[PDB]
Structures are given as C-alpha cells and as structure tokens.
C-alpha cells in the first residue's frame, strides 16, 4: 500500500471510507504509523474498544507503540513513541488533564462509533484539524452521514429478508437452528439477548453473549471454534471480527432519549429501527473472507435515518463543552454531526469542582454522561450519595417487579429512589448491580 503524502499535512482530515474488510485496520494502519514516524509526527491511534486496542498493539508490536490506560491521565516520555488508546480514554484525558500532548497526527479507527465519548473525540479532533494544529484520519466504511445499508464486500453476500424472532420460539423458525455453520445475531438489548440465547441453548446450541460491559472477557472466546451462535448488542459493529458464515439482524436497537415534559429523565425508547450505517456494519461482520463466498445476511425491516432525538448527541456536547484546549477554546462537533443537536456551543460548560465531579462520576462512578452531568451541575459532591434515595415515588427502581432496597455506606436500608432517573443504570441486571454499588457508596 502506497500512502498519500497530503494526509500527513496539517488542516487535513481524511475520511478513509474503503468498504468493510478492504484493509483499513490490518493493512494501511501500520503503513500510516511507520510513515508518521519517518516524518517525526506526534501520533495518536484511537481504537473503539479495549479488545480492538489489544489487537492493534499485537499487530504493531515491532513499532514504538505505547498502550495508554484510562487509569492514567497522561504519560509522557522523552522518546519517539506512538500513543494507543480507546476513543473514550482520549476523551477522559481531555477532561481530566491539562497535559494532553499536542498530537499532530490522529488516527481514529472505527470512527463511526456513536457513543458520546467517541462523538466528542471526533469533535475535538476535527476542531484541532480545522485550527491547523493537526492532521487526522477517520477510518470507517460508514462515516457519519452514510445511508447505504448494503455496501461492497470482499466476497458476495446473500441478503435474505425474512421474519426474525424477537423472543423465544417453539416452532416456525427451523432455518435458524438447521443452519450448519456459525451465526452472529444482533439483538436490540441485553435482556432481548438473554431470552434469545436461552432459546438457542435449550435447542443444544453453544452460545456466547456480548455486551459493552462483558466484551473484554466474552469476545476472546469467539476466537475459538467451540461455538454456534454469538448473541450480541450493537457493540460488535465496532471492528469485531468473527469467523462466521451468517449474520441474523432484525435491525433493531434501543435509543436513549432525554425527556423534558416534567422532570428531566432519560428513557430507553424502542426497540426502534437501526440506522443504515449500523445495518451496514452488522452486515459487514461477514463477506470478509475471499475464500468463502457462501456468507448470509439475514435481515428484517428497513433502517431509519432520523436519530436527532438520540441522547448521545447532547451528551457529546456535555463532554465537548468541558474539554480543555491549549488556547482555552470550546471545540465543536464534527461537521456532519453538528446537525444532530440544537445546543448552543458552551452551554454545558461547568467550572471548578463541578467539572471535576462531572468527570469523576463518569470514570470512577461508571454513570452515564447525562446522569453525571445532572448530579455535578446540581452542586453535589462525588461521595455524596443522598440523591440516590431522595427522589419522587415515581423514581423508584424495580427489580423483578418489586422495589429495590439498598444498604447505604452508613448502614441504613433505604429504597433505591434516585433524584434523577436514567433508564441505562437499571436497563439490565449488570447495570443495576453496578448502580447499586454506586448508591451504597462502594465506589
Ligand atoms: N487476525 C487476522 N488474521 C488474518 N486475517 C485477518 C485478521 N483480522 C482481519 N483479517 C482479514 O483482513 C482483511 C482486512 O481486514 P480489516 O483491515 O479489518 O478491514 P477493514 O477495512 O474493515 O478495517 C479482511 O479480509 C479480514 O478478514
Ligand atoms: Cl451493550
Ligand atoms: Mn477496520
């Protein structure tokens, strides 16, 4: 692969939108890094997930790569070194340090990731590019704005449109279990995944479940051959490689929405249709192997473009408005994503301890951006957990249709009733478990 010379020039942002599997991560990336080093550029590589980052550092092992952990706010050497980190790690460091290096070449892989930390990162990056302080490459077949759900592939894909179960089934879906080979099944939620996986397991199928929280331990198991089904949330759209012959995709997802009628709260709306980019990335899990031309994409429904009510857009602004810049400037969203919110640049900016608490609630507290923002801008200290118990009766959190009760750090049994309700902290057993740990003052 021959690298273009102009992509290393400051004020240039290159959208590397080669089709899924074309060789963006595996082939051109090491070529770009080596060429960046030759030019003595201060280089940053951004991976969507910890797993993908680990694959990058394994592949770039011969080069002066340094993986950067979010447990560390900055890490500067007096040496020629390429920094490697997750999208979210970059955004956290921007919020928590003034010692963020002045990278003049930034590569964001799987730059289609729509999680707020990634949207915020693209905002900061593009701002630096447009200010003439950096060159950046966004690697993704589906850049922000894409609407082709059936892009080019390395090998032919059989696109099959048919009814897909939303829940456990007894009969009428023989084609699912009769299939000889491996399947990746995209589900709209973890608990939808729990039910589907349970159904497949009672049929004697070996299934691995994937979600954001379990991705690190569960994904490596898919690299072995002792499995029939992967049941996964949208997280697998971000550079997850499966050696499988089929994707099952009912093209559905949950969408966080900030509601403003009465007390502000985040709900999880849907299931709703995925975006055409998401559908393409799910489909793009297969058709990757030149030697295997039998791959199937089994789908249901049309994708939906309009996602302007997605909470991730205002959450991205809450992050961006609090990002430290050398000049003191407020960075704006990436061009094509500016339309997604009506927020006035800088309206979410916090000062002093409130800004510090905002960051702490996200990184140490594991809370969503919106929820962290509401607590921090209320003037509440990080260790002060009273808000988890002082909400209105409607804010009572249920588990198995019964009221959740928590032992506090002071040793009192209080009903879990937060002042601010964000559906994501009680969306599934694991999220609730983590949030109970927060409410009981255990982190
Ligand atoms: N660990 C691996 N070993 C061998 N081949 C791989 C590995 N990971 C990916 N590939 C293959 O390399 C090709 C390009 O992959 P990649 O660079 O990830 O595509 P993309 O352009 O989507 O980033 C694909 O055909 C893929 O199947
Ligand atoms: Cl998830
Ligand atoms: Mn890739």
Short mmCIF file of C-alpha atoms and ligand atoms in Angstrom, two decimals:
data_model
loop_
_atom_site.label_atom_id
_atom_site.label_comp_id
_atom_site.label_asym_id
_atom_site.label_seq_id
_atom_site.Cartn_x
_atom_site.Cartn_y
_atom_site.Cartn_z
CA UNK A 1 0.00 0.00 0.00
CA UNK A 2 1.28 3.43 -1.04
CA UNK A 3 0.43 6.24 1.40
CA UNK A 4 -0.68 9.64 0.08
CA UNK A 5 1.66 12.43 1.24
CA UNK A 6 -1.06 15.07 1.75
CA UNK A 7 -2.84 13.11 4.52
CA UNK A 8 0.00 13.97 6.93
CA UNK A 9 -0.36 17.71 6.27
CA UNK A 10 -1.92 19.85 9.00
CA UNK A 11 -5.51 21.05 8.45
CA UNK A 12 -6.36 17.88 6.51
CA UNK A 13 -8.96 15.38 7.69
CA UNK A 14 -9.03 12.21 5.61
CA UNK A 15 -12.15 10.07 5.55
CA UNK A 16 -10.81 6.63 4.73
CA UNK A 17 -14.16 5.12 3.72
CA UNK A 18 -12.94 1.97 1.97
CA UNK A 19 -15.64 -0.74 2.08
CA UNK A 20 -15.88 -3.16 5.06
CA UNK A 21 -12.92 -5.56 5.02
CA UNK A 22 -10.93 -3.58 2.42
CA UNK A 23 -7.89 -3.43 4.74
CA UNK A 24 -8.21 -0.23 6.76
CA UNK A 25 -7.26 -1.69 10.17
CA UNK A 26 -4.93 -4.53 9.16
CA UNK A 27 -3.04 -3.20 6.14
CA UNK A 28 -2.96 0.59 5.81
CA UNK A 29 -2.73 1.41 9.55
CA UNK A 30 0.79 0.02 10.05
CA UNK A 31 1.76 1.78 6.78
CA UNK A 32 0.45 5.11 8.12
CA UNK A 33 2.13 4.70 11.53
CA UNK A 34 5.54 3.87 10.02
CA UNK A 35 5.28 6.85 7.67
CA UNK A 36 4.17 9.11 10.54
CA UNK A 37 7.27 8.05 12.48
CA UNK A 38 9.55 8.75 9.49
CA UNK A 39 8.10 12.29 9.41
CA UNK A 40 8.64 12.57 13.20
CA UNK A 41 4.94 13.29 13.83
CA UNK A 42 3.42 13.12 17.33
CA UNK A 43 0.97 10.30 16.60
CA UNK A 44 -2.20 9.09 18.32
CA UNK A 45 -4.09 5.89 17.45
CA UNK A 46 -7.66 5.51 18.71
CA UNK A 47 -9.40 2.14 18.96
CA UNK A 48 -13.14 1.79 19.75
CA UNK A 49 -12.80 -0.93 22.40
CA UNK A 50 -10.07 -2.37 24.67
CA UNK A 51 -10.21 -5.63 22.67
CA UNK A 52 -9.53 -3.87 19.34
CA UNK A 53 -6.72 -1.89 21.00
CA UNK A 54 -5.12 -5.16 22.17
CA UNK A 55 -5.27 -6.47 18.58
CA UNK A 56 -3.60 -3.26 17.36
CA UNK A 57 -0.73 -3.41 19.87
CA UNK A 58 -0.19 -7.08 18.95
CA UNK A 59 -0.09 -6.16 15.24
CA UNK A 60 2.08 -3.05 15.75
CA UNK A 61 4.37 -4.79 18.25
CA UNK A 62 7.55 -4.08 16.22
CA UNK A 63 6.89 -0.32 16.36
CA UNK A 64 7.38 2.12 19.29
CA UNK A 65 3.75 1.75 20.41
CA UNK A 66 2.62 2.52 23.95
CA UNK A 67 -0.86 1.47 25.06
CA UNK A 68 -2.44 4.18 27.23
CA UNK A 69 -4.73 3.15 30.10
CA UNK A 70 -7.61 5.35 31.36
CA UNK A 71 -6.29 4.75 34.92
CA UNK A 72 -3.55 7.20 33.88
CA UNK A 73 -4.33 10.84 32.97
CA UNK A 74 -1.16 11.46 30.93
CA UNK A 75 2.05 9.57 30.14
CA UNK A 76 4.91 11.46 28.52
CA UNK A 77 8.29 10.03 27.54
CA UNK A 78 11.37 11.81 26.16
CA UNK A 79 11.30 9.35 23.26
CA UNK A 80 9.84 8.58 19.82
CA UNK A 81 6.53 6.92 20.75
CA UNK A 82 3.08 6.29 19.25
CA UNK A 83 0.24 6.54 21.77
CA UNK A 84 -2.53 3.93 21.54
CA UNK A 85 -5.82 4.19 23.45
CA UNK A 86 -9.58 3.77 23.25
CA UNK A 87 -11.77 6.60 21.93
CA UNK A 88 -13.17 7.09 25.47
CA UNK A 89 -9.72 7.16 27.10
CA UNK A 90 -8.77 10.11 24.87
CA UNK A 91 -11.96 11.99 25.81
CA UNK A 92 -11.44 11.28 29.56
CA UNK A 93 -7.84 12.57 29.42
CA UNK A 94 -9.10 15.72 27.65
CA UNK A 95 -11.44 16.27 30.62
CA UNK A 96 -9.04 15.41 33.46
CA UNK A 97 -5.60 16.69 32.39
CA UNK A 98 -4.06 19.89 31.01
CA UNK A 99 -1.10 17.73 29.91
CA UNK A 100 -2.72 16.21 26.84
CA UNK A 101 0.06 16.02 24.20
CA UNK A 102 -0.17 18.20 21.10
CA UNK A 103 -0.69 15.31 18.65
CA UNK A 104 -0.26 16.43 15.03
CA UNK A 105 -1.44 13.13 13.56
CA UNK A 106 -4.52 11.42 15.00
CA UNK A 107 -5.93 8.18 13.59
CA UNK A 108 -9.40 7.15 14.76
CA UNK A 109 -10.31 3.62 13.75
CA UNK A 110 -13.96 2.53 13.51
CA UNK A 111 -14.73 6.26 13.51
CA UNK A 112 -18.47 5.54 13.03
CA UNK A 113 -18.83 4.70 16.76
CA UNK A 114 -21.77 6.80 18.01
CA UNK A 115 -21.16 6.53 21.76
CA UNK A 116 -20.92 10.08 23.23
CA UNK A 117 -17.21 9.79 24.17
CA UNK A 118 -16.45 8.91 20.53
CA UNK A 119 -18.67 11.69 19.13
CA UNK A 120 -16.91 14.12 21.50
CA UNK A 121 -13.48 12.82 20.40
CA UNK A 122 -14.30 13.43 16.71
CA UNK A 123 -15.43 16.92 17.71
CA UNK A 124 -12.13 17.70 19.44
CA UNK A 125 -10.07 16.08 16.65
CA UNK A 126 -11.82 17.93 13.78
CA UNK A 127 -11.56 21.19 15.76
CA UNK A 128 -7.76 20.70 16.03
CA UNK A 129 -7.56 19.89 12.31
CA UNK A 130 -9.60 22.95 11.29
CA UNK A 131 -7.49 25.15 13.61
CA UNK A 132 -4.48 23.94 11.58
CA UNK A 133 -2.80 22.17 14.50
CA UNK A 134 -3.18 18.56 13.35
CA UNK A 135 -3.81 16.07 10.56
CA UNK A 136 -6.39 13.35 11.16
CA UNK A 137 -7.61 10.17 9.53
CA UNK A 138 -11.07 8.73 10.25
CA UNK A 139 -11.13 5.04 9.35
CA UNK A 140 -14.62 3.69 8.60
CA UNK A 141 -16.67 2.36 5.68
CA UNK A 142 -19.72 4.11 7.18
CA UNK A 143 -18.73 7.72 8.02
CA UNK A 144 -21.24 9.96 9.81
CA UNK A 145 -23.85 10.64 7.11
CA UNK A 146 -23.76 7.28 5.27
CA UNK A 147 -27.05 5.75 4.09
CA UNK A 148 -26.02 2.61 2.14
CA UNK A 149 -27.05 -0.48 4.15
CA UNK A 150 -25.59 -2.85 1.52
CA UNK A 151 -22.01 -1.70 0.78
CA UNK A 152 -19.33 -3.57 -1.20
CA UNK A 153 -17.70 -6.65 0.36
CA UNK A 154 -14.60 -8.83 -0.21
CA UNK A 155 -16.89 -11.76 -1.01
CA UNK A 156 -20.50 -11.92 -2.29
CA UNK A 157 -23.21 -11.68 0.38
CA UNK A 158 -26.61 -13.33 0.17
CA UNK A 159 -29.01 -10.71 1.53
CA UNK A 160 -32.05 -12.59 2.85
CA UNK A 161 -35.12 -10.71 4.05
CA UNK A 162 -37.38 -12.72 6.38
CA UNK A 163 -39.15 -12.76 9.75
CA UNK A 164 -36.78 -12.91 12.73
CA UNK A 165 -37.91 -13.85 16.28
CA UNK A 166 -37.94 -11.02 18.84
CA UNK A 167 -38.15 -13.55 21.67
CA UNK A 168 -38.12 -17.31 22.40
CA UNK A 169 -39.87 -19.51 19.82
CA UNK A 170 -41.24 -23.08 19.77
CA UNK A 171 -41.73 -23.68 16.02
CA UNK A 172 -41.71 -21.94 12.62
CA UNK A 173 -38.04 -20.90 12.59
CA UNK A 174 -36.25 -24.11 11.56
CA UNK A 175 -33.91 -22.21 9.22
CA UNK A 176 -32.18 -20.72 12.32
CA UNK A 177 -31.23 -23.97 14.10
CA UNK A 178 -30.86 -26.18 10.98
CA UNK A 179 -28.11 -23.88 9.69
CA UNK A 180 -24.73 -25.61 9.54
CA UNK A 181 -22.11 -23.03 10.48
CA UNK A 182 -21.62 -20.08 12.80
CA UNK A 183 -24.05 -17.20 13.28
CA UNK A 184 -23.74 -13.69 14.73
CA UNK A 185 -27.13 -12.50 15.99
CA UNK A 186 -27.61 -8.78 16.73
CA UNK A 187 -30.17 -8.06 19.47
CA UNK A 188 -31.66 -4.64 20.46
CA UNK A 189 -30.86 -5.10 24.16
CA UNK A 190 -29.04 -7.30 26.66
CA UNK A 191 -32.31 -8.78 28.01
CA UNK A 192 -33.58 -9.48 24.49
CA UNK A 193 -30.23 -11.24 24.08
CA UNK A 194 -30.73 -13.20 27.31
CA UNK A 195 -34.02 -14.62 26.01
CA UNK A 196 -32.73 -15.47 22.51
CA UNK A 197 -29.58 -17.10 23.94
CA UNK A 198 -31.70 -19.15 26.37
CA UNK A 199 -33.88 -20.34 23.47
CA UNK A 200 -30.83 -21.42 21.44
CA UNK A 201 -29.27 -23.17 24.46
CA UNK A 202 -32.42 -25.26 25.03
CA UNK A 203 -32.02 -26.36 21.39
CA UNK A 204 -28.49 -27.58 22.16
CA UNK A 205 -26.64 -24.64 20.58
CA UNK A 206 -23.43 -23.30 22.12
CA UNK A 207 -23.82 -19.53 22.51
CA UNK A 208 -21.62 -16.64 23.65
CA UNK A 209 -23.26 -13.34 24.64
CA UNK A 210 -21.63 -9.96 24.04
CA UNK A 211 -22.31 -6.51 25.50
CA UNK A 212 -20.25 -3.38 26.29
CA UNK A 213 -19.66 -4.48 29.90
CA UNK A 214 -18.76 -8.12 29.14
CA UNK A 215 -16.90 -7.54 25.86
CA UNK A 216 -13.37 -7.96 27.31
CA UNK A 217 -13.85 -11.45 28.77
CA UNK A 218 -16.51 -12.76 26.37
CA UNK A 219 -15.16 -11.69 22.96
CA UNK A 220 -11.85 -13.67 23.17
CA UNK A 221 -13.98 -16.83 23.49
CA UNK A 222 -15.37 -16.19 19.98
CA UNK A 223 -11.83 -16.60 18.58
CA UNK A 224 -12.05 -20.30 19.41
CA UNK A 225 -14.23 -22.66 17.32
CA UNK A 226 -16.37 -24.20 20.09
CA UNK A 227 -19.46 -22.05 19.41
CA UNK A 228 -22.51 -21.94 17.15
CA UNK A 229 -24.09 -18.57 17.98
CA UNK A 230 -22.86 -15.17 19.07
CA UNK A 231 -25.74 -13.14 20.52
CA UNK A 232 -24.58 -9.53 20.63
CA UNK A 233 -25.68 -5.91 21.05
CA UNK A 234 -24.64 -3.14 18.63
CA UNK A 235 -21.18 -3.07 20.26
CA UNK A 236 -19.98 -5.67 17.70
CA UNK A 237 -20.38 -3.05 14.93
CA UNK A 238 -17.04 -1.62 16.11
CA UNK A 239 -14.32 -3.71 14.45
CA UNK A 240 -15.30 -7.06 15.95
CA UNK A 241 -14.01 -9.90 13.77
CA UNK A 242 -15.91 -13.18 13.70
CA UNK A 243 -15.05 -16.19 11.57
CA UNK A 244 -18.72 -16.90 10.90
CA UNK A 245 -20.91 -17.55 7.84
CA UNK A 246 -24.16 -15.85 8.87
CA UNK A 247 -25.46 -12.66 10.46
CA UNK A 248 -29.01 -12.57 11.81
CA UNK A 249 -30.17 -8.95 12.05
CA UNK A 250 -33.74 -7.86 12.94
CA UNK A 251 -32.24 -4.34 12.58
CA UNK A 252 -33.48 -3.13 15.97
CA UNK A 253 -31.90 -1.14 18.81
CA UNK A 254 -32.80 0.80 21.95
CA UNK A 255 -32.28 4.57 21.89
CA UNK A 256 -31.64 6.74 24.98
CA UNK A 257 -33.87 9.82 24.86
CA UNK A 258 -33.83 12.79 27.21
CA UNK A 259 -37.45 13.65 28.02
CA UNK A 260 -38.28 17.23 29.03
CA UNK A 261 -42.03 17.04 29.81
CA UNK A 262 -42.00 17.33 33.59
CA UNK A 263 -38.76 16.43 35.44
CA UNK A 264 -35.92 15.71 33.01
CA UNK A 265 -35.23 11.97 32.65
CA UNK A 266 -33.56 9.52 30.25
CA UNK A 267 -35.68 6.69 28.85
CA UNK A 268 -34.71 3.87 26.52
CA UNK A 269 -37.09 4.12 23.58
CA UNK A 270 -37.91 1.24 21.26
CA UNK A 271 -36.83 -1.20 20.07
CA UNK A 272 -36.56 1.09 17.03
CA UNK A 273 -35.02 0.52 13.57
CA UNK A 274 -31.21 0.90 13.40
CA UNK A 275 -29.51 3.48 11.16
CA UNK A 276 -28.38 2.40 7.65
CA UNK A 277 -24.77 2.69 8.88
CA UNK A 278 -25.44 0.29 11.79
CA UNK A 279 -27.17 -2.16 9.43
CA UNK A 280 -24.15 -1.98 7.10
CA UNK A 281 -21.70 -2.59 9.97
CA UNK A 282 -23.71 -5.57 11.26
CA UNK A 283 -23.93 -6.96 7.71
CA UNK A 284 -20.21 -6.15 7.41
CA UNK A 285 -19.35 -8.77 10.06
CA UNK A 286 -19.45 -11.27 7.16
CA UNK A 287 -18.44 -11.42 3.47
CA UNK A 288 -14.90 -10.67 4.68
CA UNK A 289 -13.13 -13.88 3.61
CA UNK A 290 -12.13 -14.03 -0.11
CA UNK A 291 -12.03 -17.87 0.02
CA UNK A 292 -15.56 -18.16 1.47
CA UNK A 293 -18.35 -16.97 -0.82
CA UNK A 294 -21.37 -18.56 0.91
CA UNK A 295 -21.97 -15.88 3.61
CA UNK A 296 -25.53 -14.89 4.53
CA UNK A 297 -27.01 -11.68 5.87
CA UNK A 298 -30.49 -12.46 7.20
CA UNK A 299 -32.40 -9.25 7.98
CA UNK A 300 -35.83 -7.83 8.78
CA UNK A 301 -37.22 -4.32 8.24
CA UNK A 302 -35.87 -1.08 6.79
CA UNK A 303 -33.32 1.09 8.61
CA UNK A 304 -34.31 4.52 9.96
CA UNK A 305 -32.12 7.57 9.29
CA UNK A 306 -33.59 10.13 11.74
CA UNK A 307 -31.83 9.89 15.12
CA UNK A 308 -31.85 13.57 16.18
CA UNK A 309 -33.62 12.70 19.48
CA UNK A 310 -30.75 10.36 20.46
CA UNK A 311 -29.39 11.38 23.88
CA UNK A 312 -25.81 10.69 22.68
CA UNK A 313 -25.78 13.99 20.74
CA UNK A 314 -26.46 16.26 23.72
CA UNK A 315 -24.22 14.01 25.87
CA UNK A 316 -21.44 14.58 23.31
CA UNK A 317 -21.91 18.35 23.80
CA UNK A 318 -21.83 17.99 27.61
CA UNK A 319 -18.39 16.37 27.17
CA UNK A 320 -17.17 18.80 24.47
CA UNK A 321 -18.24 21.89 26.46
CA UNK A 322 -15.97 20.77 29.31
CA UNK A 323 -12.90 19.79 27.28
CA UNK A 324 -9.60 21.55 27.96
CA UNK A 325 -7.91 23.10 24.92
CA UNK A 326 -4.42 24.73 24.92
CA UNK A 327 -5.87 28.06 23.68
CA UNK A 328 -8.87 27.84 26.04
CA UNK A 329 -11.24 27.26 23.11
CA UNK A 330 -14.58 25.41 23.07
CA UNK A 331 -14.46 22.62 20.44
CA UNK A 332 -17.47 21.97 18.19
CA UNK A 333 -18.88 18.67 16.89
CA UNK A 334 -17.54 17.05 13.71
CA UNK A 335 -19.11 18.77 10.64
CA UNK A 336 -21.69 16.11 9.57
CA UNK A 337 -22.76 15.61 13.22
CA UNK A 338 -23.35 19.30 14.04
CA UNK A 339 -26.94 18.99 12.74
CA UNK A 340 -27.81 16.32 15.33
CA UNK A 341 -28.35 18.80 18.19
CA UNK A 342 -29.59 22.38 18.61
CA UNK A 343 -27.45 23.07 21.70
CA UNK A 344 -25.57 26.38 21.81
CA UNK A 345 -21.81 25.71 21.93
CA UNK A 346 -20.56 26.14 25.51
CA UNK A 347 -23.93 25.99 27.30
CA UNK A 348 -22.97 22.82 29.21
CA UNK A 349 -19.62 24.21 30.43
CA UNK A 350 -19.03 23.66 34.15
CA UNK A 351 -16.49 25.39 36.37
CA UNK A 352 -14.14 24.24 39.14
CA UNK A 353 -15.22 21.39 41.40
CA UNK A 354 -18.46 20.76 39.47
CA UNK A 355 -16.45 19.99 36.33
CA UNK A 356 -14.12 17.74 38.37
CA UNK A 357 -17.14 15.95 39.91
CA UNK A 358 -18.66 15.50 36.42
CA UNK A 359 -15.52 13.65 35.28
CA UNK A 360 -15.29 11.58 38.49
CA UNK A 361 -18.93 10.42 38.25
CA UNK A 362 -18.22 9.07 34.74
CA UNK A 363 -14.78 7.44 35.23
CA UNK A 364 -14.98 6.33 38.88
CA UNK A 365 -18.77 6.16 39.27
CA UNK A 366 -19.44 4.44 35.91
CA UNK A 367 -22.50 6.68 35.44
CA UNK A 368 -23.91 7.81 32.03
CA UNK A 369 -22.90 11.26 30.75
CA UNK A 370 -26.37 12.81 31.17
CA UNK A 371 -26.76 11.46 34.72
CA UNK A 372 -23.23 12.50 35.74
CA UNK A 373 -23.89 15.98 34.31
CA UNK A 374 -27.14 16.44 36.26
CA UNK A 375 -25.57 15.39 39.58
CA UNK A 376 -22.43 17.54 39.06
CA UNK A 377 -24.27 20.68 37.89
CA UNK A 378 -26.56 20.33 40.93
CA UNK A 379 -23.53 21.06 43.17
CA UNK A 380 -23.42 17.53 44.60
CA UNK A 381 -20.03 16.12 45.72
CA UNK A 382 -18.87 12.79 44.27
CA UNK A 383 -19.07 10.87 47.58
CA UNK A 384 -22.49 12.32 48.47
CA UNK A 385 -24.98 9.57 47.57
CA UNK A 386 -28.12 11.01 49.23
CA UNK A 387 -29.60 11.86 45.79
CA UNK A 388 -29.95 8.11 45.13
CA UNK A 389 -32.65 7.94 47.85
CA UNK A 390 -34.37 11.35 47.83
CA UNK A 391 -36.28 11.16 44.53
CA UNK A 392 -40.05 11.19 43.98
CA UNK A 393 -42.01 7.93 44.38
CA UNK A 394 -42.22 7.59 40.58
CA UNK A 395 -38.41 7.34 40.51
CA UNK A 396 -38.50 4.06 42.49
CA UNK A 397 -36.37 1.43 40.75
CA UNK A 398 -37.91 -2.02 40.35
CA UNK A 399 -36.26 -5.44 40.06
CA UNK A 400 -38.48 -8.42 39.17
CA UNK A 401 -41.49 -6.07 39.62
CA UNK A 402 -40.55 -5.32 43.25
CA UNK A 403 -38.90 -2.34 44.97
CA UNK A 404 -35.10 -2.22 45.19
CA UNK A 405 -33.73 -1.57 48.70
CA UNK A 406 -30.09 -0.72 49.41
CA UNK A 407 -27.79 -0.85 52.42
CA UNK A 408 -26.01 2.53 52.49
CA UNK A 409 -22.38 3.15 53.50
CA UNK A 410 -23.72 4.37 56.87
CA UNK A 411 -25.56 1.06 57.37
CA UNK A 412 -29.14 2.13 56.67
CA UNK A 413 -31.63 0.23 54.50
CA UNK A 414 -33.09 2.76 52.05
CA UNK A 415 -35.23 2.28 48.94
CA UNK A 416 -33.37 2.95 45.69
CA UNK A 417 -35.12 6.11 44.51
CA UNK A 418 -32.76 8.47 42.65
CA UNK A 419 -33.40 12.20 42.21
CA UNK A 420 -32.54 11.79 38.52
CA UNK A 421 -33.78 8.80 36.54
CA UNK A 422 -31.57 7.44 33.75
CA UNK A 423 -33.01 4.18 32.36
CA UNK A 424 -29.50 2.94 31.46
CA UNK A 425 -28.49 2.41 35.13
CA UNK A 426 -31.29 -0.17 35.57
CA UNK A 427 -31.66 -1.48 31.99
CA UNK A 428 -30.31 -4.95 32.79
CA UNK A 429 -29.11 -6.97 35.84
CA UNK A 430 -25.45 -5.95 35.34
CA UNK A 431 -26.18 -2.22 35.00
CA UNK A 432 -28.38 -2.33 38.11
CA UNK A 433 -25.69 -4.25 40.01
CA UNK A 434 -23.12 -1.55 39.20
CA UNK A 435 -25.54 1.26 40.10
CA UNK A 436 -26.39 -0.40 43.45
CA UNK A 437 -22.63 -0.44 44.16
CA UNK A 438 -22.61 3.30 43.46
CA UNK A 439 -25.70 4.03 45.61
CA UNK A 440 -24.31 2.02 48.55
CA UNK A 441 -21.14 4.16 48.36
CA UNK A 442 -18.86 1.25 47.45
CA UNK A 443 -17.08 3.16 44.66
N1 LIG B 1 -6.24 -11.72 12.75
C1 LIG B 1 -6.40 -11.81 11.41
N2 LIG B 1 -5.71 -12.73 10.68
C2 LIG B 1 -5.86 -12.84 9.35
N3 LIG B 1 -6.69 -12.06 8.63
C3 LIG B 1 -7.44 -11.10 9.23
C4 LIG B 1 -7.34 -10.91 10.69
N4 LIG B 1 -8.18 -9.91 11.01
C5 LIG B 1 -8.76 -9.49 9.86
N5 LIG B 1 -8.33 -10.20 8.80
C6 LIG B 1 -8.74 -10.03 7.38
O1 LIG B 1 -8.05 -8.93 6.77
C7 LIG B 1 -8.90 -8.28 5.82
C8 LIG B 1 -8.95 -6.78 6.11
O2 LIG B 1 -9.38 -6.58 7.46
P1 LIG B 1 -9.56 -5.11 8.08
O3 LIG B 1 -8.31 -4.31 7.79
O4 LIG B 1 -10.04 -5.28 9.50
O5 LIG B 1 -10.77 -4.49 7.20
P2 LIG B 1 -11.36 -3.01 7.42
O6 LIG B 1 -11.07 -2.32 6.10
O7 LIG B 1 -12.83 -3.23 7.68
O8 LIG B 1 -10.60 -2.45 8.60
C9 LIG B 1 -10.27 -8.94 5.92
O9 LIG B 1 -10.44 -9.81 4.80
C10 LIG B 1 -10.22 -9.75 7.20
O10 LIG B 1 -10.98 -10.95 7.10
CL1 LIG B 2 -24.19 -3.12 25.22
MN1 LIG B 3 -11.50 -1.80 10.47
#
